Structure formats: structure tokens, C-alpha cells
Structure 1
Amino acid sequence: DTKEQRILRYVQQNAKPGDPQSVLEAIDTYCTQKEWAMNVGDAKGQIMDAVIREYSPSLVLELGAYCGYSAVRMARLLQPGARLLTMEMNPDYAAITQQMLNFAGLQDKVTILNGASQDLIPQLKKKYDVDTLDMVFLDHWKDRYLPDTLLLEKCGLLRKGTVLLADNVIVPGTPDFLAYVRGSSSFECTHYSSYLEYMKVVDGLEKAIYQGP
């Protein structure tokens, strides 16, 4: 019995099947009252909602799924026919994410890819029929934000206007990624100050819009 398994069971027993809003609410209730978990949370989740609504992306890539919280949060705002691809290297987390999406009724909109982003990113064009990404949500190992961004560019996966949205740029922090995008002529950045999920600790999201080479 793991924390992630307890979060999934709590959702299944305290949310309505096929209702993504009740799913997010049960996850946020559980993590506020019972056990903290590394889901994006409601404070950063609200900023993520505002960004999704502004861009209405047709194809989103998320790096790091955990329990499926951010996938549910993004997929519930996607337009009919829009898709989300989420890469999760932990197989136990990938199985929880799948079941979470299944319960929320969003399974048709999301594809969970169980594996390392550095291995999966180069397969996106040929195997997954991807041309370019409309948006990327970075929420995996913090030291992978910068190499995976550089890898997405190399693979031709970024277009003029691709929205990169990075969680935890303050806590645990992503200093090399943050310095790079803020210093590059190929990105237009915006910092969205917020709070670490379920905590009175300052955190933030960085939006970095790819401008081409």
C-alpha cells in the first residue's frame, strides 16, 4: 500500500466517475487533510487552467505524470479531438495515472507513455505521428528540464509559438533551465509566482514561448 495507491483509492471512493472536477477536488482534499503529494495542486493548477484556456492547444506533451493530476487538469479543458501525451518513467506511477484518467473519463484524450523522456522524445515523429507540439508541460526530474528542452528543439518538435510551461522553477527549482530560457532570444518568458502544492511555500511556473531559431 503506497501513497499513490491511497490517493487513487480515495478518488475512486470520494469522486464521481467521469467527472474530472470532482477527481481534482478529491485529490486536493486528500493531500491537504491526509498526506502531502507532489501533484501540481490547486494554486498552480488555476494558473495552468488560465494558460490552457488562452492557447487551446491541439497537442500537449507532459513530462512526468505522477498520479495523473495535471493530466486530468489539462485534458478536461482540451477541445474535442485535442490530445495529450504524457511521459512517465515510473511504472507504478504510470499505472496509477492510467487508472486516474480511466476514472475521470479522459482515457480517450490522453496517452500515458511509460518510459524515460530522453528515450521517448526522439520517437515522437516516427512512432507517434507527431509533427510539432503546441504545448509542453515540464514536471519531471528537475535536472531534466533543460536537456529535454534542447532535445525537443533538436528533434524538430517545437514550432514558433510552442508554449513551454514548467512547474517548480522555485521549489525544488530548475536554475539551469530558468537561466537558459530567460537568457535566450528563442524564448519569450513569463514567471507566474504561486505556492508549492498544499504548502505555504513560494513556488512558481515559468512560461517560455518558443520563437524559432
Structure 2
Amino acid sequence: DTKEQRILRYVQQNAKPGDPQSVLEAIDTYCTQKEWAMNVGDAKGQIMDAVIREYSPSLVLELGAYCGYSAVRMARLLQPGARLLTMEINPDCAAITQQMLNFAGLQDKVTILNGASQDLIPQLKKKYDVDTLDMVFLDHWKDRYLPDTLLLEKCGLLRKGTVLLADNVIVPGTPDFLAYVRGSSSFECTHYSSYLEYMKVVDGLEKAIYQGP
């Protein structure tokens, strides 16, 4: 089996069904004590929680589900009727994410999409009935943060006040994305310095609030 399957099995055997906080704790324990994995982790997760609570978004898009850790983290804080769409290009990890969300009891809040962001973003309006997004969490290929931000704007998916929140802007890093949003009058940016998941290595989240054209 794979590391991702071991993480799912550990949640199933060490968390409580229907209890998202137990699921997060189980994943963080496994990834601290057994095998590192690229979940956002609790350090950066606590900053995400604070941002989600500030904005109470009704419709969130996540680029890069992995095993569903960030999807559980965000979906557990959504208000009744609010929704998360999460894109995952690896079909094995899409299946693990769906199972993780089922276990946590969050499956009615989340739609896990299996494909590439450049293919799926242009289908959001017609196929998934999206008007505009309230928040976007970027956690997929680091060289796609910038092109997919521009693709979201082209597709008319951003509105004044849409919150982009970007993982890993320091490690592995997303230098073109940061330079772009920080230099653009169309974004209001804030950096939240933190640590790479499970490691004593500096990383950070970038919040970039879209201001219209």
C-alpha cells in the first residue's frame, strides 16, 4: 500500500467517525510520528481556520486536495448550506480524499473533483453551477498558482472581495505568484509567516484579496 492509504487507515482506526477534529488530530499524529506527508498541517491550519472564520465563505474552491486534510479543516468551519469544491489530479488521492470526508461526516458539504485545474476551472460555471467564488485555497502545483489565478479571473469566477489563500509560498515557494499579486493593484495582500507542515522550517501563507479589474 501507499503512504496515503496508510494515513487513511490510521484515521479509520484512531479517529471517531463523524468527528472532524479527531480526523485532523489523527492525521497530524501519524505524520509527526510515522511518515511525513504534504498536508497543510496544524501550524498553517490554525491560520487557515482564523481566515475561514473571518470571512465565513459560502463557496470555496480548493486546488489540490491530496488526502483531504485541508478539505476537512475548511469544511468543518463552513456554515450550514456552504460548500467546498476541491480539485485533485491524482485519482488515488481523489478516492482517499472522498473516503476521508465520508469518515469525517462532511461529504454533503464537499464535492471532490478528479482532474487538472486548467481543464476543470473553465467548466465551473456551467457544470458545477458556480457564479463567483468567495474564497480559493491554492495548494496544487506551485508553478500553477499564477496561471490559475489569471484563468480564474478570465473565467469570471472572481468578484470584489474574493479571498485567495496560498500555501507554500516560501517552501517550496511560488515566486512568480507572489511577485505578481504583491505588485498588482487588483490584489490586497497579507503574508502570514508560519512553518512547513511537521517541520522546523519556515513557510507561510499568502492572502490576496481580489479588488476587481
Shift of 1:132: 0.1
Shift of 1:127: 0.7
What do residues 47-101 of structure 1 show as CA deviations (whole Å, max 9, x unaligned)? 0000000000000000000000000000000000000000000001000000000
What do residues 87-139 of structure 1 show as CA deviations (whole Å, max 9, x unaligned)? 00000100000000000000000000000010000000111110000000000
What do residues 171-205 of structure 1 show as CA deviations (whole Å, max 9, x unaligned)? 00000000000000000000000000000000000
CA distance in 2, matches of 1:65, 1:111: 11
Aligned to 1:48: 48
Aligned to 1:130: 130
CA distance in 1, matches of 2:144, 2:58: 24
SS of corresponding position for 2:85: strand
Shift of 1:42: 0.2
Aligned to 1:161: 161
Shift of 1:13: 0.1
Displacement over 4 Å in runs of 4+: none
Task: Show the 5 A alignment for 1:121-200.
Answer: 121-200=121-200
- How many residue pairs get matched? 213
CA distance in 2, matches of 1:145, 1:133: 16
CA distance in 2, matches of 1:126, 1:21: 34
SS of corresponding position for 2:165: strand
SS of corresponding position for 2:126: coil
Unpaired runs of 5+ in structure 2? none
Shift of 1:166: 0.1
SS of corresponding position for 1:199: coil
Shift of 1:3: 0.2
Sequence identity percentage: 99
Shift of 1:149: 0.2
CA distance in 1, matches of 2:177, 2:67: 24
Could you say what the CA RMSD is over the residues aligned between the two structures, in angstroms?
0.2
Aligned to 2:113: 113
SS of corresponding position for 1:160: coil
CA distance in 2, matches of 1:35, 1:88: 21
Task: Show the 5 A alignment for 1:87-102.
Answer: 87-102=87-102
Aligned to 1:2: 2
Shift of 1:25: 0.2
